[PDB]
């Protein structure tokens, strides 16, 4: 025949291959397809769907449905924020559980901006004023609204709007973002203060609470396929 | 997901009337098409594509949730129950409509979850199924979630807070007293036997606890209409009586 | 940029789905008795079962490949000739294979490979032999699944003084694959 | 991922004290601070004590502030609760938490604990 | 030689392949084809035939010539069915001796509309009418006249025409119906009734017989070509 | 069990087995010496094992791993390394 | 299948060979270039840059700063040459250590000119006049000025221009001169000669140096990639 000779590689089965075999069953008639609705082209698809974050994974709320629970409660003026979250997606417990860090659990690199929604759950006739904040990749963690106030944020009116979004620019340093537990990867820092304190009307149950919403966006990508399963 | 600013009060009031039926909507606008799909072909018609409204829940502070299946529900509505059951096959769409009206003065937020092939609680993957064609099938009456569907496990082994996958909406008392959902037929086959499968499952969680200030109403009520879309069954089969 | 992420993609990769054990005793050793039947699904390994239920549905072009590894068992210096092994498809529902003797093991219809130990390990493309447009990956209404056949294997080669142990490892890759509804995963253990 | 256990709890008496710790994993403590929060029986998480690790500068409740303390010690991994002059109310579930800092808000920890359960008033 | 890799599949003999292969009779002259009538181009069109149906195979009746003969006796006008066949071609054991479930028994699916037709062998002299029904997936035998008169059904006149098509249509839920022998696969109903009651002339021995014919049609199918012999 | 890491089975006796691994570099080049504040860039592992089942004849085994850098770029140039290493 | 037939070389691994092969990661996002300054092309052109050359290996000069200083010291008008250097870039200690020498180890064969520049590193206030000369392969290291004055060379005159470029033609039998340790390869002959004695002004310290370079030129090529390492 054709003068042929084996190179290196042959005999072997690479489990990442894309070479062709031969089918088990000619002729077969295949049942062709229907359009049922809700087909999916890629995995980042499913990330830029707004997903709710649990926000207070407590001893007693964590696993349950008050994980899922912001409650504006009634202490002090002092600044201590009312909710803080690391922009750690992977790295950080409460983000990782949401169809976006899922999806972040499959990869080593994400770049890209990330959207926070917050739905007020408060009682219509009640108002006051929110600021939700981000602090870019490094710096500590602001404490006081003074701080919060000087980055990245919207002033947030209950009264207004219910809903509010607040989109996490992509300030980072490499091109693709380490979506692996790193030491101390950054890395926004979105959280809500109360620029005032709630304003109640007649006799309200007083405590309301706020549900947070998280997607990636068209510029969210993902490479290297890593895994793990038990 | 659903991050929508209607108005907020009430506007205008524009009434569906589908046949011998009636609804007085709080408005119409701020409908959610599943995957974006309106209902299609692939017989009463226009007498058989009315909304029929199942009965009314009460929604208390201890509520844990509630959830139907479709066909299933709507199987006792005259023309839609009838040409369900005298025939073998059936597949169409629905237009559920879930309203609920409180004031100014309540405050919660309910999640009206539309989801296709929603088995329920029976960790059992070994063998989904279960419960008995009868526990399975509540009808109208509809089946209740608790703290056998586990309210945070959506009933079904997965975190509620991802939920928001399958098409929804939330009726947040702030915001808005009505969601509507059109769902297109979803189901591995053509057509299929609607007595058998059940193609979607209507869930309907306290996302936020109800409260009421001072003394009001003890607890409010929430309603579920929904309209058959694009019906079809094959074949006149025996009309026994 | 996300090619690396597409659904064709995201399941590009050959998975473990079982390890089907035989053997080729001299004597009654039954258990094996030369023959291991396996029932084609995924849902015995993890990995692969988890990758695929992020959705609800799929069609998907089925590629199996098959690594076969031998051994002798008893600490004797006895010898063997390189064996042959078959490996079949059985079309789903078919007739199911107990005894290495009986009829089935001639299947007329179902298709059938015979694989010398030694070289490249074996490989087959099955069509999506769905019975549904679809393949359901949790069913609702009233486990069994869909069902993708079974795979039977046996030492061809007769009886041989000195007991040969094997291991069929098949590895499952979906080809040309799509999905449809998608719900939330599976958080916990199966 | 850091599963930090509570230790130093157990039932004393009214006027009392009792020292608590939590030693860190899956990171070294230094980086997420540390605090504690006594859930009562029956009711919400109750904010006690906070500490930041690399920059000092301790927070407490009113409830409890003057006579309760603590502290940090990022080289043994472990963070100090001194709680001083216990009473009767002061019989809650305890519980050391991670967050950001150092600063007593329901949550804005992570990792939690067990919860560990100091009955000061144990004599009647 | 041309650089050459061996890859997975090399080596095995797949049962079903389609390769070439050398040809051990070089230039043999091969003796060429008359046109001899009768050619057979697909296994679906020897299921287009009429074939003759044993819709009587009792104890005594089965594997002989009266298994063919439907007797229309001289009982009550009772309802009672003067003959019941399920359409459940293969999960059936009278409509799987025909031609059509013969080709019915190497296949897990078919798909199409049948045709059941029948010839009154009776003395000619003689009238009366009678009805052939069908029944749709699922429900009941219907027992009484009153009941099969609702379902699809055609009033078969002896007087005027012996012979009778009452095509059974494609009613049913998945695109290929399961040829395999199912729990209650459904699966129509064929079945004729006393309409009237038999009118006889003169003297006719009162007591003739009826054939049954079972075809498949153009638009019949099957798939995954199943097996077995012993 | 891998399911995203690749694989390769190699039977013995025949061609030595042979892969592609592209440009897998975290920065835009791989860092020969790095500055700033060991681990250098990382190119990943490789683990090895017989798969066939535990044999009462032992048998030793020996991979031999040959890195052909291709298509290869590179940028500033710094005197060599005189010494030992 | 296709006739085919395995030759010899089949199965056996060239390391020098240029064989396609299956590739591990499919798909996977290559994280583009930049253009960072400086890329190199060829080997070559690393030799092309200017190389201070260590003149000085003396016992406790050599391995040290001082090896890259040449200093005019005050010593007789007795021509003894003030540097002699081999042109045997490989076979001489000292221009082994070089960039242009250190290719230079990697090759059996090399063609080319080359060019030794020098500068002057003395008080501006000083004068004098020396002489850099060459000496074509095979000739005795002219160690007398009037003898190197003879050969290829060019007076430098300190006073007017610290540095001094003298490029070494290529003068060679062969095409390819041996870049191997040879007996007595030929080899030029770079040495610098007090043309004049060193003219001092007031009161400098009489005492300077002068560095070396080497490098190569356009039309230098190598062949034979040979080697070493320990």
């Known amino acids: 025949g054709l003068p042929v000779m084996n190179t290196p590689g042959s005999n072997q089965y690479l489990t990442a291959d894309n070479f062709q075999s031969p089918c088990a069953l000619p002729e077969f008639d295949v049942t062709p397809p229907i359009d049922i609705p809700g087909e999916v082209k890629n995995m980042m698809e499913l990330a830029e769907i707004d997903t709710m974050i649990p926000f207070d994974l407590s001893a007693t709320k964590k696993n349950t449905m008050e994980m899922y629970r912001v409650r504006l409660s009634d202490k002090p003026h002092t600044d201590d924020p009312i909710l803080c979250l690391s922009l750690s997606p992977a790295s950080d417990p409460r983000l990782s559980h949401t169809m976006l860090g899922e999806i972040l659990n499959y990869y080593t690199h994400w770049a890209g901006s990330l959207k926070f929604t917050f739905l007020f759950c408060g009682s219509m006739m009640a108002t006051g004023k929110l600021l939700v904040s981000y602090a870019p990749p490094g710096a500590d963690p602001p404490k006081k609204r003074k701080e919060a106030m000087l980055g990245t944020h919207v002033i947030w009116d209950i009264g207004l709007q219910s809903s509010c979004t607040m989109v996490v620019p992509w300030i980072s340093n490499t091109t693709y973002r380490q979506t692996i537990d790193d030491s101390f990867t950054e890395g926004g820092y979105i959280s809500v203060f109360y620029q005032t304190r709630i304003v109640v009307p007649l006799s309200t149950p007083r405590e309301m609470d706020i549900l947070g919403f998280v997607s990636a966006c068209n510029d969210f990508s993902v490479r290297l396929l890593r895994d793990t399963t038990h | ?241 | 940029s996300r090619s690396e992420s597409s659904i064709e993609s995201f399941f590009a990769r050959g998975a473990c789905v079982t390890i089907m054990t035989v053997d080729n005793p001299a004597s009654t050793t039954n258990k094996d008795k030369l023959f291991a039947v396996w029932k084609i699904t995924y849902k015995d390994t993890v990995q692969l079962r988890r990758k695929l239920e992020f959705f609800t549905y799929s069609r998907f072009d089925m590629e199996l490949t098959f690594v076969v590894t031998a051994n002798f068992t008893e600490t004797n210096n006895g010898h063997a000739l390189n064996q042959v092994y078959q490996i079949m498809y059985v079309p789903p529902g078919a007739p199911v294979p107990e005894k290495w003797d009986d009829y089935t093991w001639q299947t007329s219809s179902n298709p059938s490979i015979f694989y010398t130990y030694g070289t490249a390990p074996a490989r087959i493309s099955v069509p999506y032999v769905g019975i549904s447009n679809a393949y359901s990956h949790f069913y609702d209404g009233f486990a069994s699944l869909n069902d993708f056949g079974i795979l039977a294997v046996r030492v061809v080669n007769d009886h041989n003084p000195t007991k040969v142990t094997s291991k069929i490892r098949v590895y499952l890759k979906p080809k040309h694959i799509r999905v449809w509804c998608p719900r939330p995963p599976r958080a916990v253990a199966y | 991922q850091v599963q930090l256990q509570e230790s130093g709890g157990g039932s004393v008496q009214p006027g009392g004290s009792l020292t608590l710790s939590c030693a860190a994993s899956g990171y070294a403590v230094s980086r997420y601070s540390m605090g504690w929060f006594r859930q009562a029986p029956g009711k919400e998480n109750e904010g006690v004590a906070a500490i930041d690790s690399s920059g000092v500068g301790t927070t407490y409740a009113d409830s409890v502030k003057g006579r309760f303390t603590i502290s940090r010690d990022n080289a043994k991994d472990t963070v100090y609760l001194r709680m001083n002059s216990l009473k009767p109310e002061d019989t809650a579930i305890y519980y050391c938490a991670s967050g950001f800092g150092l600063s007593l808000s329901r949550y804005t920890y992570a990792y939690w604990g067990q919860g560990t359960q100091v009955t000061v008033s144990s004599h009647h």
């Open chain 2, 1 to 241: 997901s659903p991050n929508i600013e209607a108005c907020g009060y009430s506007d205008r009031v524009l009434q569906l009337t589908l046949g011998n039926s009636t609804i007085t909507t709080q408005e119409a606008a701020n409908s959610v098409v599943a995957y974006g799909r309106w209902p299609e072909y692939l017989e009463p018609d226009v007498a058989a594509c009315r909304f029929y409204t199942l009965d009314t829940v009460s929604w208390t502070k201890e509520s844990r949730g509630w959830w139907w299946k479709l066909p299933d529900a709507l199987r006792d509505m005259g023309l839609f129950g009838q040409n369900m059951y005298y025939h073998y096959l059936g597949r169409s769409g629905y237009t559920v409509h879930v309203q609920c009206n409180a004031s100014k003065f309540h405050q919660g937020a309910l999640g009206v979850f539309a989801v296709p092939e929603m088995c329920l609680a029976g960790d059992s993957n070994t063998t989904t199924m279960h419960t008995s064609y009868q526990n399975a099938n509540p009808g109208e009456k509809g089946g209740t979630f608790t703290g056998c569907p586990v309210d945070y496990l959506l009933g079904n082994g997965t975190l509620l807070g991802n939920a928001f996958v399958f098409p929804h909406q939330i009726i947040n008392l702030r915001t808005n007293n009505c969601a509507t959902l059109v769902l297109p037929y979803v189901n591995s086959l053509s057509i299929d036997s609607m007595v058998k499968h059940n193609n979607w499952g209507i869930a309907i969680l306290p996302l936020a606890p109800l409260n009421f200030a001072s003394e009001s109403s003890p607890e409010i009520p929430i309603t579920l209409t929904i309209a058959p879309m694009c019906c079809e069954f094959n074949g006149l089969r025996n009309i026994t009586l």
